Write a protein that binds this ligand. Structure first.
Ligand SMILES: Nc1ncnc2c1ncn2[C@@H]1O[C@H](CSCC[C@H](N)C(=O)O)[C@@H](O)[C@H]1O
Ligand SMILES: Nc1ncnc2c1ncn2[C@@H]1O[C@H](CSCC[C@H](N)C(=O)O)[C@@H](O)[C@H]1O
Lengths: 265, 265
């Protein structure tokens, strides 16, 4: 009669909340999906061991096409949990699943967990200053769209930061690196010439947020584009106008060029 | 030699992550601050019991003025944890504390936890569509500023959602309700007349995110301004142009007026 959407966290199996773990252990059946985001520090094995229950993994089709056929039926009679990386409902399509639950007469509750949206706070950039977010899609075709570049421009003009998720191809095990996002954006800049993403643009890279020692680096594209930020996942941020304290943290904590402290008030 | 910034979550003591709990239990000393945000479902007692250690609570002055005198000294010799509501570093000033740690020769690590920034995903609004965020300050003086109203206008024009934190006075135990934020914003609208926040404006209220049964309601101000959303904390959101799926979720899950499904493409 109850379905619980439980977030697993960002890195490993301990990034789930105590509330999430306890509820999962009390559920008759436990499902999960691992295709929406990469959790670099754990496996299904470790997660299953932590919960002490076998977990039925669902594929993208299982979810998008047969969630109401696979999960909900059982949810009508028992307590069922559905696990996902990060925060359960931060994926554009996860929310709709709550609708299918309601319509099937199943009550649902959401158990939050660390998300990259809030975790970016560890970059020192003020969270309230972030504008619209976007994803740097993997280019497909000789000619491809670049709307994510327009989002950066739109935010930057308002002096707002831009969070950029980097595309992934789970089945192919392909995870776009910050380097690839930069290479790609520099090319878009030559084509659009908006002065939005140049060799001299200050950017911030956050790799493996959630782990104890993530890579946090800030600097000009020309300097970071060849830098190794470790294993994926990577996130790229294009800051808008910095507050002195933001810049202080980027210099002190992320190794940013000292000149960014001269924010030209 | 190590300082851990550990997030406690949004509602109760189980909103901390398993990683956070385990690390806290291994720390020689545990500090915390509870003034930045209200955790409506727990107490210091319950948190202390969960961790199994006495917790030295620090005041705003203890932190802002003497963090390097109270916490860091011990952090230099032992493993020390600093607990905070929600996500440790989502407070504009918390990040700077990592700087004081570095400068004192103390290594620090951040343990994330549920945050209201990501938790708003439970409203069905696409997280990437949120623009700049703002706080509805408690009015002080016969005449007072209302920059938060300008943030809404700026986002709305771009068709972006606006997340609005509501002010609190911890010592006074005063927590601004969504009703009070609405009353206040309607008054600002008469004065500024930007057509940004009217009787007919669609708004979303999220109360006690993190608890198992939070209040999620969407509707026109004229209809919600007199509605009771339960105990604090409350958060107010002014959606921009809705995607059909966003509207579908607001109607189905938050009881929004069916007419919002007619988004006037
Ligand atoms: N540990 C991590 N470190 C850096 N970036 C991460 C990350 N985890 C996720 N991301 C970014 O976010 C993308 C997934 S989008 C889904 C986010 C998830 N629903 C949440 O609540 O956070 C990843 O492809 C990557 O772009
Ligand atoms: N449980 C909750 N439900 C609704 N709003 C909440 C909430 N917890 C916090 N908020 C909102 O966020 C404000 C605190 S701002 C600090 C946010 C915290 N650092 C985090 O990581 O989330 C509260 O005053 C209220 O405006």
């Amino acid at each position: 009669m109850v379905l619980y959407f439980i977030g697993l966290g960002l890195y490993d199996e301990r990034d789930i909340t105590v509330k999430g773990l306890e509820i999962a252990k009390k559920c008759d059946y436990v499902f999960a999906e691992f295709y929406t985001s990469l959790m670099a520090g754990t496996t299904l094995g470790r997660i299953q061991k932590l919960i002490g229950k076998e977990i039925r993994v669902l594929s993208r089709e299982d979810v998008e096409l047969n969630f109401e056929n696979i999960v909900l039926p059982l949810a009508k009679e028992n307590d069922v949990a559905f696990l996902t990386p990060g925060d359960p409902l931060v994926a554009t399509t996860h929310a709709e699943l709550r609708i299918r639950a309601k319509r099937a007469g199943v009550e649902s509750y959401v158990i939050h967990a660390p998300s990259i949206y809030s975790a970016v706070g560890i970059t020192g950039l003020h969270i309230y200053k972030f504008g619209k977010s976007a994803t740097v899609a993997y280019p497909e075709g000789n000619m491809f769209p670049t709307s994510y570049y327009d989002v950066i421009k739109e935010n930057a003009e308002r002096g707002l930061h831009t969070l950029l998720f980097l595309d992934i191809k789970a089945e192919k095990r392909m995870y776009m690196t910050a380097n690839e996002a930069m290479e790609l954006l520099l090319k878009v800049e030559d084509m659009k010439k908006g002065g939005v993403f140049t060799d001299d643009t200050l950017v911030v890279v956050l790799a493996r947020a959630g782990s104890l020692n993530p890579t946090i680096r800030a600097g000009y594209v020309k300097d970071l584009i060849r830098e190794d930020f470790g294993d994926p996942p990577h996130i790229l941020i294009v800051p808008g106008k910095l507050h002195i304290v933001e810049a202080e943290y980027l210099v002190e904590i992320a190794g940013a060029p000292r000149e960014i402290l001269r924010v030209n008030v």
